[PDB]
Amino acid sequence: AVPKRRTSKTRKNKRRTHFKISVPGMTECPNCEYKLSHRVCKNC
Amino acid sequence: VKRTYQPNKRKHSKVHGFRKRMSTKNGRKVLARRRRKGRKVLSA
Amino acid sequence: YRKLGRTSDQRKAMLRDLATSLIISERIETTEARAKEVRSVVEKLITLGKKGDLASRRNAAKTLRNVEILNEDETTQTALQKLFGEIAERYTERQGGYTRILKQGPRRGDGAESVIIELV
Amino acid sequence: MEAKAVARTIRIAPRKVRLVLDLIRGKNAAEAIAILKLTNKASSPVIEKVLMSALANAEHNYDMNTDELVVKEAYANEGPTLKRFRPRAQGRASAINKRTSHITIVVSDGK
RNA sequence: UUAAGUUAUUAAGGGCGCACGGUGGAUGCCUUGGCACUAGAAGCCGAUGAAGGACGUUACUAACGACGAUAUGCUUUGGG
RNA sequence: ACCGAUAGUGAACAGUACCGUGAGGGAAAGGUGAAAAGCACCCCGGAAGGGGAGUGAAAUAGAACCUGAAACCGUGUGCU
RNA sequence: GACAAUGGUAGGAGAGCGUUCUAAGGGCGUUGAAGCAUGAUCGUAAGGACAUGUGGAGCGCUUAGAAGUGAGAAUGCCGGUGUGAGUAGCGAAAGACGGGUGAGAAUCCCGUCCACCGAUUGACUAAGGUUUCCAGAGGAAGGCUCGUCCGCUCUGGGUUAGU
RNA sequence: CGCGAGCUGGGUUCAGAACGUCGUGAGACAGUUCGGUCCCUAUCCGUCGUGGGCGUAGGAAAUUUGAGAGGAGCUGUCCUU
RNA sequence: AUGAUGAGGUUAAUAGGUUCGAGGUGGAAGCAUGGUGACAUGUGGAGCUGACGAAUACUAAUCGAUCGAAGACUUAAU
Ligand SMILES: CC[C@H]1OC(=O)[C@@](C)(F)C(=O)[C@H](C)[C@@H](O[C@@H]2O[C@H](C)C[C@H](N(C)C)[C@H]2O)[C@](C)(OC)C[C@@H](C)C(=O)[C@H](C)[C@H]2N(CCCCn3cc(-c4cccc(N)c4)nn3)C(=O)O[C@]12C
Ligand SMILES: [K+]
Ligand SMILES: [Mg+2]
Ligand SMILES: [Mg+2]
Ligand SMILES: [Mg+2]
Ligand SMILES: [Mg+2]
Ligand SMILES: [Mg+2]
Ligand SMILES: [Mg+2]
Ligand SMILES: [Mg+2]
Ligand SMILES: [Mg+2]
Ligand SMILES: [Mg+2]
Ligand SMILES: [Mg+2]
Ligand SMILES: [Mg+2]
Ligand SMILES: [Mg+2]
Ligand SMILES: [Mg+2]
Ligand SMILES: [Mg+2]
Ligand SMILES: [Mg+2]
Ligand SMILES: [Mg+2]
Ligand SMILES: [Mg+2]
Ligand SMILES: [Mg+2]
Ligand SMILES: [Mg+2]
Ligand SMILES: [Mg+2]
Ligand SMILES: [Mg+2]
Ligand SMILES: [Mg+2]
Ligand SMILES: [Mg+2]
Ligand SMILES: [Mg+2]
Ligand SMILES: [Mg+2]
Ligand SMILES: [Mg+2]
Ligand SMILES: [Mg+2]
Ligand SMILES: [Mg+2]
Ligand SMILES: [Mg+2]
Ligand SMILES: [Mg+2]
Ligand SMILES: [Mg+2]
Ligand SMILES: [Mg+2]
Ligand SMILES: [Mg+2]
Ligand SMILES: [Mg+2]
Ligand SMILES: [Mg+2]
Ligand SMILES: [Mg+2]
Ligand SMILES: [Mg+2]
Ligand SMILES: [Mg+2]
Ligand SMILES: [Mg+2]
Ligand SMILES: [Mg+2]
Ligand SMILES: [Mg+2]
Ligand SMILES: [Mg+2]
Ligand SMILES: [Zn+2]
């Protein structure tokens, strides 16, 4: 129910290895800057 | 659920007010103690 | 079919509201899942309107809301009348596919995918 | 040269800001702008404003190229923490840390 | 070319060292306030309404000091 | 041959804030600079906040303002 | 020079290190004191220097004197900051769309439709609270999200009795 | 006397009450009787599933050998002889 | 659960719609007729029908972007 020992800096960052976001899937707008793929401009 | 403090202007003044304190020697002792300590509020 | 995070009665009512709003405004912005669900409702309604008979009109009245639409100049009509009038005539020679969905991207408040669904 | 901009005491926890910062570090300015515009995170417009400010510094104060700029440095430091409390059960109060960030962006032409 | 054998390159992340930042308010320096005493004096006021307060008074206005409808002060005698 | 801001009064800025029906309990909180000379003006930004330009001996002395330790949080990488 | 001795708890004995203050002597310091930081330095230990950076006005040395004189543990006291962790939770419920405003809108305004209470989720008195009421302006903090909104902030207003 | 951070809580070491018994008494028991709050968001190892990295001396698509590991393993009745 | 796996991405049946089926329900609405009426009969195995089957590009799978080798050495048979 509770941590028996505190988590070291090393273990914490090891666990955060995969905690990240990825670059959006984006494409240049041929006529109308960049946009999400399969989305309309909605602002151009 | 019902709690202990049920406010009542009249009750509060009659039990803890200035005149009730002046009414007994021990109440006057309370006022003297509070004046000696330098309290802003001496009674209700 | 999708549940849309609602009970059956709530989901049915929301789908009726969305379908009537689409019929009235011809172009609405909603979430992705709601639009994917309502495309079927709206297109089956348009099928009934193309059928045109009295029984089809009453079956359509089971689903449509009772809303009024002020047209060009102070002339009113119901959403059912528009569905069996202008909308049905617009799609006489089109065999299905009366709507399209255009994705807009996430919105600020909850990251939900906003889309436009419009009549074709 | 190098141009810099700093947004101090932004009311977003540094853990969350750094997630977005990691995307644009080392990228070209235009690519970073597109990434920030299309990234769905609360930090994105704050970071975008810091980057725009850095690019404006470049152009106006140092007459830099404005099209050959890269995001040389991008980091978030910890600002002062607003200490708050949430009532819990049994009359107990629990601490809430409303953390802040200092956000820095450095652009450069590489020369 | 094959066979048998040997040994690299990678770092998602981690470790050590170093560099540069942030946070935080220790440390040093400082004193507006204290602490303990010495010497000289004085100790207690009030129905001629006390001690302590409330409410007000400044051109502007919250609090504190001062003042009391003569109110952020009046007269007078000296100093300056 | 007393203290020097966790000390010394509880109180250097308070019997206040706050807690309690009440008697009563009772904090935290000092330092820009020699002088406000407290950053005209330009730029990004709704603002906040910044980068310049100025003031200053010093602005990593810019008011959350002397010094600014450690825990803690980041960025770069020499070896691994 | 040449022989011996030198494990150690409670505990006894001896000799020293360092901190603040005082007296006397002698010195340092804006050509940069204390403090802080770094270093591959010295001493048998406690510990002592030097160099460089930071800092910006006080401080060593010698001899002697006096102590609030040395912390790693007290479920110690106060402060700061971690971990658990982007985890638990975000406090009974029906919303949808259009239009508007705005730097920014699921969350503000307006509209239509839908839905909930209705011996009450309606209306009015009392206690209690004491300006929370109204208008205009705002969005740092507060609001368990957002916020252009607000019982929040700023400015100006508002309570009328012979019954 | 495996197993309550897996469950229950009938019994047993709780405050109420009663009987028998003992004690002057307050009370008590080689006894009995009715009633009587079961908290915890899993950090590490362990276990069940399921992904990412790199390695496997070029890179890849597919088909595979099997070192080794797990699973399975019960039995009745009747007829005939 | 999410990753993952598998079917597809216009040189396309991946999903939705449309049209037609299977199965389910059991006789729609409207109208006519009979009945004072409740109702009944006929039109007519009718109407309706999520997930199942087929056909059909009507709608959506646009454009595009990212990663990804160049085969080390030593000795033997050829
Ligand atoms: C249900 C919550 C309670 O848990 C429990 O009661 C149990 C089920 F968790 C519990 O009985 C645990 C297991 C207990 O520990 C045991 O103690 C034994 C002596 C020994 C044993 N082991 C070591 C052999 C221990 O594990 C004990 C002492 O709690 C009484 C633990 C201690 C730390 C204790 O007192 C704690 C603080 C105890 N407590 C007093 C409750 C006291 C009884 N209570 C009060 C309330 C209540 C109060 C306010 C509002 C509401 N709605 C309810 N509900 N129940 C609370 O307020 O909360 C809890 C946690
Ligand atoms: K019929
Ligand atoms: Mg669903
Ligand atoms: Mg229902
Ligand atoms: Mg409570
Ligand atoms: Mg990496
Ligand atoms: Mg540091
Ligand atoms: Mg005054
Ligand atoms: Mg200090
Ligand atoms: Mg003090
Ligand atoms: Mg400035
Ligand atoms: Mg500036
Ligand atoms: Mg400037
Ligand atoms: Mg400045
Ligand atoms: Mg400095
Ligand atoms: Mg400082
Ligand atoms: Mg010895
Ligand atoms: Mg020996
Ligand atoms: Mg001794
Ligand atoms: Mg000694
Ligand atoms: Mg000594
Ligand atoms: Mg000193
Ligand atoms: Mg001591
Ligand atoms: Mg301790
Ligand atoms: Mg903590
Ligand atoms: Mg944590
Ligand atoms: Mg998560
Ligand atoms: Mg966990
Ligand atoms: Mg979870
Ligand atoms: Mg959750
Ligand atoms: Mg709620
Ligand atoms: Mg109802
Ligand atoms: Mg109001
Ligand atoms: Mg908020
Ligand atoms: Mg207000
Ligand atoms: Mg057992
Ligand atoms: Mg049990
Ligand atoms: Mg157990
Ligand atoms: Mg029991
Ligand atoms: Mg007897
Ligand atoms: Mg029972
Ligand atoms: Mg085998
Ligand atoms: Mg093995
Ligand atoms: Mg058998
Ligand atoms: Zn575009």
- Among the residues of B1-44, which ranges form H helices? 9-16, 18-22, 25-37
Question: Are D111 and D2 a contacting pair, CB within 8 Å?
Answer: no
Residue type, C46: I
Chain E bases closer than 7 angstroms to a protein Cβ = 12-15, 21-24, 51-54
Q: Are D40 and D66 in contact (CB under 8 A)?
A: no
CB C27 within 8 A of CB C116: yes
In chain D, the DSSP E strands lie at 2-10, 70-78, 82-87, 93-98, 101-108
Q: Which residues contact C44 (CB under 8 A, 6 or more apart)?
A: none
Tell me which amino acid residue D102 is.
Answer: H
Kindly give, in sequence order, each residue whose CB lies less than 8 Å from that of residue D27, ignoring residues fewer than 6 positions away: D35, D70, D71
Q: Which nucleotide has the least CA–C1' distance to B31?
A: E52
CB neighbours of residue C96 within 10 Å:
9
Bridge partners (DSSP) of residue B1 are none
For residue D106, the SS3 value is strand
What secondary structure letter does DSSP report for D65? -
Q: Minimal CA–CA distance to C83: which of C13, C12, C26, C17?
A: C26
Residues 6 or more apart in contact with residue C67 via CB below 8 angstroms = C20, C24, C78, C79
- Report the C-alpha gap between A15 and A17 in whole angstroms: 5
Please give the single-letter amino acid code of residue D71: V
Mutate to test the interface with A, among D38, D39, D67, D71 (most CBs of A within 10 A): D38
Contact predicate C43/C99, CB 8 Å: yes
Which CATH number among 1.10.760.10, 3.40.250.10, 3.40.50.1220, 3.90.1030.10 corresponds to the domain C2-120?
3.90.1030.10
Do the Cβ atoms of D19 and A21 come within 8 Å? Answer: yes
The CATH code belonging to domain B1-44 is 1.10.287.3980
Note down the domain range covering D62.
Answer: 2-110
- Other CB atoms within 10 Å distance of the CB of residue B21: 19
| C111 in Cβ contact with D42 (< 8 Å) | no
Report CA-CA distances (Å) from C59 to B30, C15, C45, C46, C82: 85, 16, 9, 12, 15
Contacts of D93 (CB under 8 A, 6+ apart): D85, D86, D87
Q: Which residues contact D74 (CB under 8 A, 6 or more apart)?
A: D21, D24, D25, D47, D104, D105, D106
Hey, what amino acid is at D47?
I
Q: Spell out which chain D residues touch chain A, with contact meaning CB-CB distance below 8 angstroms.
A: 19-20, 22-23, 30, 33-35, 37-41
How far is residue C28's CA from residue C18's CA, in Å, rounded to a whole number? 9
Could you count the other beta carbons within 10 Å of the beta carbon of residue B27? 17
Interface residue A18 vs chain D (CB under 8 A): no
B31 touches strand F (CB under 7 A): no
Nucleotide minimizing C1' to CA distance for residue B40: F15
Method in brief: cryo-EM
Resolution (A): 2.1
Q: Domain map of chain B by residue range?
A: 1-44
